[PDB]
Design a protein around this nucleic acid. Structure first.
Ligand SMILES: [Mg+2]
Lengths: 155, 386
RNA sequence: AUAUUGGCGAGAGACCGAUAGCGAACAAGUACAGUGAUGGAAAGAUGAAAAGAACUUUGAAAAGAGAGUGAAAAAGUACGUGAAAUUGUUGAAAGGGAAGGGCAUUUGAUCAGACAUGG
RNA sequence: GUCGAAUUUGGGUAUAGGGGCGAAAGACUAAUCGAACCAUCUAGUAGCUGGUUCCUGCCGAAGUUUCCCUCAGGAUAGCAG
RNA sequence: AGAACUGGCGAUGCGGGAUGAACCGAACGUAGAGUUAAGGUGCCGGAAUACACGCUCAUCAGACACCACAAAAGGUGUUAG
RNA sequence: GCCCUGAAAAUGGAUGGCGCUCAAGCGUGUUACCUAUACUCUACCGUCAGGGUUGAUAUGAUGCCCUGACGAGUAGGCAGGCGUGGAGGUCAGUGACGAAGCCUAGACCGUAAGGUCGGGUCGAACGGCCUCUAGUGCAGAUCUUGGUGGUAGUAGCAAAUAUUCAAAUGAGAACUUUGAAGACUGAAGUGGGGAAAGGUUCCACGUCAACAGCAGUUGGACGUGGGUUAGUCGAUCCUAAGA
RNA sequence: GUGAACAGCCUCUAGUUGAUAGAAUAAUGUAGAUAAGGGAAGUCGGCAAAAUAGAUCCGUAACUUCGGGAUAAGGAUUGGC
RNA sequence: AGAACUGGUACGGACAAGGGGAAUCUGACUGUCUAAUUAAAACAUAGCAUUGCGAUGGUCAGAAAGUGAUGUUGACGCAAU
RNA sequence: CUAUCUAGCGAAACCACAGCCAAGGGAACGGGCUUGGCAGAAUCAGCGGGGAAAGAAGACCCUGUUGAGCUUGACUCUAGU
RNA sequence: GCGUUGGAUUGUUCACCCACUAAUAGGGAACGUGAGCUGGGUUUAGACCGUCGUGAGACAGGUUAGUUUUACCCUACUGAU
RNA sequence: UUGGCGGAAAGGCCUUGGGUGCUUGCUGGCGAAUUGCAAUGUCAUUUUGCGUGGGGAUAAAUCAUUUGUAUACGACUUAGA
């Protein structure tokens, strides 16, 4: 408990977390935003296709030097990619949430992702050896991911 | 600081920037001065460049070591089926330039052209000029009005024509559409000619004739990203140079403190627009003619098509223009053949040619025979046959 | 009677308060380095009490979501408070080769000072 | 380049810092050499370089004199509180 | 580069000289109203595209102290003597 | 006198710019107009000066009151104050019904150093006044120690010929095991043993958080165990340079 | 096995197939090749490259410390049966 | 070693494997050194020459010594250039 | 084989604040100031003009009442003899 | 507006000859241009000589050998979305 | 509503014929206050979301796949009911 800022009816909502996960903070940020406010199954379906290389994740912030793809066109963008490890972890969290929702008997068909937020876990430090007898840091930038699914309210 | 020796700059700054052309169909940017005293006629034509071959002819040029003597010249052949007229566009003069006021189109358009208006034909509903057509319903007015508007205002008049690309070996089904200025006389006469030709066909032999000098307009063959050396013809640096030697060593003096628009740099080479002038017509082919490729000296029955077929193109089954020398663009590419913006009197330009012989051996290797008939005569019987 | 930065036993301080105070408040002359003489750190704080999360559910698992314990989990053996740099998300706003500042006012937001006179 | 000897090389042993060792380059003596490494004397001295931490109020300079192994420094008088 | 007297800059903002340590004006608590300095008043820009007598036409005119240079020498250009 | 010739330099460019020709140019005259932290008059802050006033009569005599003048400032001198650790004294000061601390384009006082309040968070101590005392106030010192950015998902992860099909196992297989294929080291070995050195890395079972700069079910890794058998092989004895 | 051979090249025994991977094939590179005609004109300088090369038989200058120079130079030859 | 036959005249067919000549400066040669910018014409060298010394000695070591190197030596030797 | 594009993995240098010019003046060569030219999101590969780019408080020079290595009929000594 | 060259000797700029040619003008851009090259000359440390000096060393005298680092950032420029 | 004219960016202009409101050309009958002596007192035109009733119309582009006239990646150019 204690997620970031949410403004959603907790009674119509369910949520999931993952902490100290060894995936790229920057890549997974980019992909969390890719499905933000999405209806869960659209999200689910799309992420499955990004694995299949049929659509992609737009890279909007952590993105300089990244190649260009025709697949960014959809999202008005030139620079997108296919972050498998990120997609994969986000899927696990979506899956969990979805489980938690069923347990609360929320309507699977009304569910959209109402909150999704990656921030930065503590780094994991390894060493690289460099020319002239030096050492440099070779680190991991792990992620904390949290998200929330909620029932869309009706007319 | 005063460059030690002097040399001319590499490359022409009048052909910048050296980028990819906007369209693959290079634009006609000038049509000939109009002489409104003579029959309404097209001022250019559209074709597909098919390949090159070789000619022999006597030269006619008093005072040349080669007068009254055979010379042998490269030619290029461009596949030139008839062009169909499907619209007229009228232009007015303004203090801001020529401007189009309307376009009036033909009642019926073929799929070939209609296809040019779509990116996904297979799955479109092909609604292209379907409401426009109905403008013909009414005994005329809507159409007849706009024709009248072009007569009243309108200062220059172009027809819209397209290629019949299906009459051509090309895989491409989408035809090429273009405006061509009508130079024959009188604005009113122009639009009538145009009206009368809607949906009708126009052949090259009504535009161009033997001995004529004509211009070619075409996008040049692409080559992708080039280095400085081949892109600009900059000089190789010595073998000894560190970090590579296809460069220019000095990109600039210290001031102006900015690399300047005139130094040579790597980037795109090819796929540029070129208007190439002064290409003499050496043949106007008839497609119905089974002796296309023959001469009053070489009496044999043969078509212009090489043994084996034009490499990377196929056969020539239509009217065609044969032009001396060479032309920008590559095989398969659309070319606009434009008439001269001027009255050349060159002597070279006035000469009337007559071919004596047209090469027809295979261009797919060192071909030794002009016709299947000649080959069999030479080789005698094989193990296939009979 | 005098000396006494050592040793043993004691009483103290207008001394320092974990980057301070001895190098060491801790398995510190340790871990580690160096052939060697030598060099030599970092490192304290869940809670009154482990009551350290039974059980259910999702997951290959780590874990998540519930539940439960507790005065508190805005204390979960990453633990008291938990600043700054720097970061994610949310909300508002501006942005034709920097941004920031001064005097002034428009506009938006926000906050006031009133206080009492017969019914 | 040399490649059967003024050859190459293991281990053992000896030479120690104004000392060694040098078919001699001031070379080599544990990534150190025109004097090794370690600790202490040692917080070495510095007319030179850098920095020197809250606010407001009042007054407010000098780059000149004389003397100095004085000339990027002092003392002396002046100006200032 | 080096002296004399004074005034400055340095230690000092402000108004003018587009700009600018040193020129011109003028030295400074926080403000209101008025008036000026040096400098300006076609438009940029606050302020007469004001008034008056001349002079000047440059196929390289000219346009304001310090100040951002010009000379000898020539002209049947035009002016007045 | 004005004008013209005399009058040649390097990126494109400067009466400040536009542009101006009975001028918006040059000489001269006359009015009006614009505008500085300057001048004039007034309010307020402070500084300095002069003067009055506890004579009995509530609350500051280093006070209250009246009057005139003045205000630039580096180096630097002096003054009056703001703030911190601790000390004597005092408010019989605040506090678990919430101390201290922290956060807050919320509020109020002060020219300022600062002080005060609300709200949030928090959990055990703390403050005002008169004094005493200093290890007492940071932006800088290529300052010290720690922590963090942009750089950047970037440079890169290209020497040593080379891999492929299938099955098995597994949550998961480009990378494990088995099979098949294709190849390499080519006995001057990528074979089989040792010396120095390491010290358990050997073998088995289990097994992946970390480590093996992709991966991992694999390992020289992690956990738990097992293992080195001498009259004859060495040391041991001998002597060598030398100690 | 080839061959003068403990060379190079290919093999048997034994051992490996381990040194991120996928898709492309722009410039510029790093490493490996080739170029018509000319032939050092390039350049401080033939730097870099190229050319020669094993064996058999012929032949072999100046000079010389009489040992050399000398594989001097210059030529023919070379498989299979 | 010889001969006949044979081929797109090829045949040390891959691998392997000296370019040559005429001179000038310089060091005789083989050898040596600046580990990590200098391999050289620098150092060495054999050869030549000079110097000291007959041991109660020459040259060198040590604070000193019943101390030490040459010396298990003796001028065809040791030491110094 | 790289570069390039993709999955996984993921450093460093450097950083007052920043990043379009012309002229002017100015510590006499401006990204900033003054006057003009101008000026439109977000970007990819290349590039070597500029950032008087970046790497060790300048190797050269001078100053300092700062050294050290080395030499000598400088000054003052000393083992030895 | 447009051209202004090919060579011999020299590290050279310069100089000087040969030769072609329409002509073989002169200059600037941090004496343009080294994260563009090269490294021949200068100007560290090796070394020979001549002059100088008792010597260590010195020479604006000759001679030989002597490590050329980084772009992935901004801007500019080339091209590309 | 009858005719016409206007393409420089015409997008507006002139015209014919009636209908309808108003008519301050002129003569009457009413009304206005207290909004308290000024202060807030005439509504303009842009977009954009919704609301009703009528007329209307009934597509493509992108990804993926594919061509190679194209290409570093994007991009380009082809093909597919
Ligand atoms: Mg004057």
């Amino acid at each position: 408990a204690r997620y970031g800022a949410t403004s959603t009816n907790p009674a119509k909502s369910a949520s999931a977390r993952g902490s100290y996960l060894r995936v790229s903070f920057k890549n997974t940020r980019e992909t969390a935003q890719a499905i933000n406010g999405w209806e869960l199954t659209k999200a689910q379906k799309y992420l499955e296709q990004v694995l299949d290389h049929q659509r992609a994740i737009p890279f909007r912030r952590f993105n300089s030097s990244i190649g260009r793809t025709a697949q960014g066109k959809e999202f008005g963008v030139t620079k997108a990619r296919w972050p498998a490890k990120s997609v994969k972890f986000v899927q696990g969290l979506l899956q969990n949430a979805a489980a938690n929702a069923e347990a609360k008997g929320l309507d699977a068909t009304k569910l959209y992702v109402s909150h999704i937020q990656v921030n930065q876990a503590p780094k994991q430090r390894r060493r690289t050896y460099r020319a002239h007898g030096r050492i440099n840091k070779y680190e991991s930038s792990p992620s904390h991911i949290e998200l929330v699914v909620t029932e869309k309210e009706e007319a | 600081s005063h460059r030690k020796y002097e040399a001319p700059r590499h490359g022409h700054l009048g052909f910048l920037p050296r980028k990819r052309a906007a369209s693959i169909r290079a634009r006609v940017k000038a049509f000939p001065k109009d002489d409104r005293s003579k029959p309404v006629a097209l001022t250019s034509f559209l074709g597909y460049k098919a390949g090159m071959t070789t000619i022999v002819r006597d030269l006619d040029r008093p005072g040349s070591k080669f007068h009254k003597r055979e010379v042998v010249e490269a030619v290029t052949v461009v596949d030139t089926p008839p062009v169909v007229v499907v619209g007229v566009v009228g232009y007015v003069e303004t203090p801001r330039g020529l401007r189009s006021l309307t376009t009036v189109w033909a009642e019926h358009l073929s799929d070939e052209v209609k296809r040019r208006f779509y990116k996904n034909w297979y799955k479109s509903k092909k609604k292209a000029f379907t409401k426009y057509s109905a403008k013909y319903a009414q005994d005329g007015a809507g159409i007849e009005r706009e024709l009248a508007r072009i007569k009243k205002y309108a200062s220059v008049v172009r027809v819209l024509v397209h290629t019949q690309i299906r009459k051509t070996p090309l895989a491409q089904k989408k035809a090429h559409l273009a405006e061509i200025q009508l130079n024959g006389g009188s604005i009113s006469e122009k639009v009538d000619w145009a009206r009368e030709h809607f949906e009708k066909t126009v052949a090259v032999d009504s535009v161009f004739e033997q001995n004529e000098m004509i211009d070619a307009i075409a996008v040049t063959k692409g080559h992708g990203f080039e280095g400085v050396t081949h892109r600009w013809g900059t000089k190789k640096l010595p073998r000894k140079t560190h970090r590579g030697l296809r460069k220019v060593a000095c990109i600039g003096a210290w001031h102006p403190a900015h690399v300047m628009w005139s130094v040579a740099r790597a980037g795109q080479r090819g796929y540029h627009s070129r208007t190439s002038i002064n290409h003499k017509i050496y043949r106007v082919g008839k497609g119905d003619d089974e002796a296309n490729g023959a001469t009053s000296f070489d009496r044999t029955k043969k078509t212009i098509t090489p043994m084996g077929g034009f490499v990377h193109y196929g056969e020539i089954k239509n009217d065609f223009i044969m032009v001396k020398g060479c032309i920008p663009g590559n095989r398969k590419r659309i070319v606009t053949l434009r008439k001269s913006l001027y009255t050349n009197t060159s002597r070279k330009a006035l000469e009337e040619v007559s071919l004596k012989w047209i090469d027809t051996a295979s261009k797919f290797g060192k071909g030794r025979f002009q016709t299947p008939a000649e080959k069999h005569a030479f080789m005698g019987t094989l193990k296939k046959d009979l």
